[PDB]
Amino acid sequence: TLRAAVFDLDGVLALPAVFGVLGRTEEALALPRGLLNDAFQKGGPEGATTRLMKGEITLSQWIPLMEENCRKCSETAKVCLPKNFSIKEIFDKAISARKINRPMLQAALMLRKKGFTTAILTNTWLDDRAERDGLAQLMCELKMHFDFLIESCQVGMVKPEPQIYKFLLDTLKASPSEVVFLDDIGANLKPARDLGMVTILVQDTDTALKELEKVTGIQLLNTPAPLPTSCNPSDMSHGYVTVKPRVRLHFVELGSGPAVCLCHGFPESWYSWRYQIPALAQAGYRVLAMDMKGYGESSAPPEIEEYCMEVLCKEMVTFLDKLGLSQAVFIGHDWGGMLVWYMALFYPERVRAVASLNTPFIPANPNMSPLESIKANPVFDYQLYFQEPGVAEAELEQNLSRTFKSLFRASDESVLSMHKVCEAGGLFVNSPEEPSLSRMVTEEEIQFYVQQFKKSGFRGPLNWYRNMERNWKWACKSLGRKILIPALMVTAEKDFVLVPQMSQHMEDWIPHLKRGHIEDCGHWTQMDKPTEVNQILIKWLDSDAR
Amino acid sequence: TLRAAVFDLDGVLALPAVFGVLGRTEEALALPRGLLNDAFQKGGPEGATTRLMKGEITLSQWIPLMEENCRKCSETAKVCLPKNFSIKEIFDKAISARKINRPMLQAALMLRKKGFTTAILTNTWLDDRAERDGLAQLMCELKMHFDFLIESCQVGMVKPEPQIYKFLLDTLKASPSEVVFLDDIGANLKPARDLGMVTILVQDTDTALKELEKVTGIQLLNTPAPLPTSCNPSDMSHGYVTVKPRVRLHFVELGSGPAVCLCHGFPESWYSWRYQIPALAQAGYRVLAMDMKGYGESSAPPEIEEYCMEVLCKEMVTFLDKLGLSQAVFIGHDWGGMLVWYMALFYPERVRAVASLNTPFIPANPNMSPLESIKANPVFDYQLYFQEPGVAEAELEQNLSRTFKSLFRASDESVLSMHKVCEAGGLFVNSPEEPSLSRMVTEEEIQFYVQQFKKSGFRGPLNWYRNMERNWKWACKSLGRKILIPALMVTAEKDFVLVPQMSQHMEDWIPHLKRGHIEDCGHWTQMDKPTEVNQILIKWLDSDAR
Ligand SMILES: C[C@@H](NC(=O)Nc1ccccc1)C1CC1
Ligand SMILES: C[C@@H](NC(=O)Nc1ccccc1)C1CC1
Ligand SMILES: [Mg+2]
Ligand SMILES: [Mg+2]
Numbered sequence A, B: 001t002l003r004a005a006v007f008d009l010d011g012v013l014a015l016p017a018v019f020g021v022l023g024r025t026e027e028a029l030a031l032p033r034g035l036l037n038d039a040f041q042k043g044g045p046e047g048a049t050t051r052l053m054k055g056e057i058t059l060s061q062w063i064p065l066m067e068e069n070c071r072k073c074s075e076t077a078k079v080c081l082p083k084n085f086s087i088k089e090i091f092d093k094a095i096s097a098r099k100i101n102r103p104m105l106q107a108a109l110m111l112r113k114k115g116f117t118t119a120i121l122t123n124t125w126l127d128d129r130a131e132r133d134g135l136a137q138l139m140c141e142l143k144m145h146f147d148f149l150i151e152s153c154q155v156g157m158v159k160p161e162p163q164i165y166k167f168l169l170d171t172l173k174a175s176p177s178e179v180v181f182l183d184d185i186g187a188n189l190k191p192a193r194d195l196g197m198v199t200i201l202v203q204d205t206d207t208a209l210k211e212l213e214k215v216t217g218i219q220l221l222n223t224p225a226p227l228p229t230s231c232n233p234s235d236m237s238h239g240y241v242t243v244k245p246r247v248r249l250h251f252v253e254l255g256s257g258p259a260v261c262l263c264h265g266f267p268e269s270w271y272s273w274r275y276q277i278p279a280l281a282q283a284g285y286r287v288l289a290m291d292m293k294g295y296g297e298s299s300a301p302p303e304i305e306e307y308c309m310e311v312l313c314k315e316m317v318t319f320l321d322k323l324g325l326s327q328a329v330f331i332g333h334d335w336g337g338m339l340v341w342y343m344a345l346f347y348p349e350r351v352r353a354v355a356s357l358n359t360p361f362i363p364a365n366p367n368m369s370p371l372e373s374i375k376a377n378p379v380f381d382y383q384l385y386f387q388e389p390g391v392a393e394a395e396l397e398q399n400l401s402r403t404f405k406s407l408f409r410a411s412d413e414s415v416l417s418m419h420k421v422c423e424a425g426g427l428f429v430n431s432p433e434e435p436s437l438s439r440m441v442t443e444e445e446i447q448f449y450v451q452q453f454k455k456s457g458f459r460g461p462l463n464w465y466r467n468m469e470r471n472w473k474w475a476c477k478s479l480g481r482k483i484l485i486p487a488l489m490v491t492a493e494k495d496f497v498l499v500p501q502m503s504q505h506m507e508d509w510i511p512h513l514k515r516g517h518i519e520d521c522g523h524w525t526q527m528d529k530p531t532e533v534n535q536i537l538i539k540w541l542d543s544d545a546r
Helices: A018-028 A035-041 A048-053 A059-076 A087-097 A102-113 A133-143 A162-172 A186-194 A205-216 A276-282 A309-323 A335-346 A370-375 A378-385 A391-398 A400-407 A443-456 A459-466 A468-476 A530-544 B018-028 B035-041 B048-053 B059-076 B087-097 B102-113 B133-143 B162-172 B186-194 B205-216 B276-282 B309-323 B335-346 B370-375 B378-385 B391-398 B400-407 B443-456 B459-466 B468-476 B530-544
Strands: A004-007 A117-122 A148-151 A179-183 A198-201 A237-244 A247-254 A259-263 A286-290 A328-333 A351-357 A487-492 A514-518 B004-007 B117-122 B148-151 B179-183 B198-201 B237-244 B247-254 B259-263 B286-290 B328-333 B351-357 B487-492 B514-518
Touching: A004 A102, A004 A162, A018 A035, A018 A087, A035 A059, A048 A059, A059 A087, A087 A133, A102 A117, A102 A205, A117 A162, A133 A148, A148 A162, A162 A179, A162 A186, A179 A186, A179 A205, A186 A198, A198 A205, A237 A309, A247 A276, A247 A309, A259 A276, A259 A335, A276 A286, A276 A530, A309 A335, A309 A468, A328 A335, A335 A351, A351 A530, A370 A378, A370 A468, A391 A400, A391 A459, A400 A443, A487 A530, A514 A530, B004 B102, B004 B162, B018 B035, B018 B087, B035 B059, B048 B059, B059 B087, B087 B133, B102 B117, B102 B205, B117 B162, B133 B148, B148 B162, B162 B179, B162 B186, B179 B186, B179 B205, B186 B198, B198 B205, B237 B309, B247 B276, B247 B309, B259 B276, B259 B335, B276 B286, B276 B530, B309 B335, B309 B468, B328 B335, B335 B351, B351 B530, B370 B378, B370 B468, B391 B400, B391 B459, B400 B443, B487 B530, B514 B530
Parallel strands: A004 A117, A004 A179, A117 A148, A179 A198, A259 A286, A259 A328, A328 A351, A351 A487, A487 A514, B004 B117, B004 B179, B117 B148, B179 B198, B259 B286, B259 B328, B328 B351, B351 B487, B487 B514
Antiparallel strands: A237 A247, A237 B237, A247 A286, B237 B247, B247 B286
16 A cells, blocks of 8 residues: 655655754754754744745855844843854864764665655755855765655755645655655644655654554564665666777766776676665775676777786786776785785785785696696586686586576585596586576576677687786786785685685785785675675775775 | 887886986995995896896895895905985985976887887886875876886796796897897896897987987987877776766866866867876866866756756766865856856855966956857857857868868868858858868867767757857846956967957956966967967966865
């Protein structure tokens, strides 16, 4: 029956409420109880505050009017305002104080996940203060989770006037009894109730959500930890840079602040970072999530040598040059992780800091051809299978959905064994035709990978494995160097290809290396444990890249 | 005969040289003359410094080796080094001291403009210092002006070894007598001379350029002020954001630092900002140069109301939301200038600061329909001509090259009179079939506009003029507000459509407005006086947006 949920902002989605601060201010300052609320509300529907809220005047213009109402109220109460009483002051403080009420936001998210239309309905103002950005960020973070954000000052109407409710209902394409509205001001709920809406008066958060659970039939309190926010491909800014005549790089870009270039592995996509991209932007970074060369919407030329590490690296430097970035933080996973260590070794002037998920840094052995080195380890047998051009492309392109559903599996989900793959004759020879769906991915997310890899197939991607000798000779040039820029190695307990123990000597070559470790995490680190990756990257970025 | 010019970096393209600082340091510190040069050069071809320069070790690894050579040199000279002697210290200082030698850079540019292949040949290092970024920026600014930058530490070879010259000649696809090379170290010039190259020993800049003029036959000294750097479309990062189902915005993006969104006028392109984009990036800004809705690679839906200011503004806010920007600086010219004032009035929380070229802010008159207001002024008669859908599109699309060559004209070049255009029956009725080329634009640059406007024509662009009443009613909502965020109005003396006097009352509504004025500048401000625009925007950005 209910099909829409509407949340107030102040005191409902954001806490503390700012009425809360006027109360505290009178007390803290020993003024007559309610005096600041009297100035604030002075003149009711024609007073300064309603003009603010309807968008007629800005917040900076309203400030000196509140001053005057503050004076008039105190003269009529026969008291004085303190020396250096400051309205600007009180409001800035109140506004930077208010944060997102996480449990209310998560209830709004879940309700939207079960198909409610959701909105924010707020009396707010046109903010032209020097410090306006704080609230702009908060409004940005909140709004992306809702169907509509309706602000009094943008629509020229204010709660509790009945016209804003009619605007609300008309925006929601829903009738009043399909609607639940939560607000902390009962006056605000009166007109809503009159049209026949379910309303909930919000004091303490938990009782509100109890009423909201009871009325919607949906579990909202005590629910498990939800996943971080993901990305919808068609809502992203997509960028394209030509690095040389045949070769463009595509990337997805979100956020502002220091550039953070994310480099995915095999056989993956910018979309492998879907859980990190919104968190890192939200943490104050400019995220660039690449399609690496060979993939997705980046160019995939056929020739093997277009994918040696030397060339891949030079082209990532060109990518920075054309975008006008003197540096970026480079964060890589799997093959992208190998690339970022090489960026650190050959272009340290261009890398602000370097982090790898799963891929360790192990210096080339100048006394052993890499083919040799490969044979002395059963787990890398599958790389020999990748060598012969055409062979692995035929198996991996033969059925895309089966390819990704077989690869992308959590550590307890019957991961593909990477074992005597040549002897067996292929990677999938012992896996079902129709694998079940991993818990890590939806069927939609698999079909995004399928659709990406329909553009170029597996030739480019496989070519990354086909420059063993050439990469070896290049890496040998770097054997006298150490990596002395800020560096993070994140190991994944149950990645059985890139095992944590393989990273154990990195401090010999990266003396100030920092570390994280994710337990119970297989090879697909970003989507296996997105919450922990986010926390480890953001904490390292804030201390070492900022 | 000469077809290539090669410039050293230290002491040639960048000044002061760092050998210069070792000299000063000995003196300043009263050490034995040349001692620091002895430590630096210690061991010659096998010493620490040559290993640095060949890329074998990084700058941070070399630092403590120079220390040791500094010690060994002083013990053998029978002196002491001062307390807190610091190599790191001396080099950081020396490196942040060196700037681009502007006159040498401009000679390299001109020589490249007359078709020389140009390069930088430098003994330099892999820089992993905390402060590495300073030099990375300098290297970035220099490199975009040259065909090749060859660094000793990236190629594993050093001047004066003869192999680096052979690598040079092979990179240039030229023989030794087609080559001029300038360096401040004569030892560096010896091997070049042996292969038969013209060489020039660089002490003072002017004598070097005198020798360079004499040898190339090209005037390089005392030449006029060159234009700022422009943009080549296919070297840019191109971005695309979908703001609603039918509508994407394209933009060109360059630089890092605070977001600066550039909004062009009618009938223009992101490319109208080609002279500002590199300067603003170089000044430490993240430039986003839009195709505005209707233009270029942005969507151009047909319906008139898709181009009212309300909708254009909401969609620019969506553009920010999807890119994850809580704010941008908005800088507009002509119609884009009108839009940025409206962004400031309806979304001040999203605009860090606002600047307009030519377009004044004049509050809507709530007592006079805008058609009326239009008739009471002969210069805006041409807007009536724009009203009737189809009419102006036919004239403006009929011959594109003639359209832009007729519009884009400096103030002394027979600008189109915007006079009784309806009565005359069109905008070009009294202009030639084949206009000459304005000094402001090359024939290539005109053909870029032609090719852009072949995608969608003039319907979208003209539609911006077709929402007079709707924009009026919207703007009337804003009549109680003032614009109280940082704001800049730049007037153009000889713009006879948007005259400077039209802006004279802006302080009544924008009390802290800042100003610039460009004399001898017609309507196409960015390309008429690109040098002065750059200087005025960068100075306002650095003081008011930073
Ligand atoms: C060793 C290699 N990673 C790798 O093969 N992952 C992989 C293997 C099989 C299937 C999917 C991914 C690159 C150097 C880091
Ligand atoms: C008045 C209008 N500018 C305008 O028509 N420029 C123009 C006129 C004719 C040809 C090219 C450009 C917009 C509001 C600022
Ligand atoms: Mg409230
Ligand atoms: Mg030199």
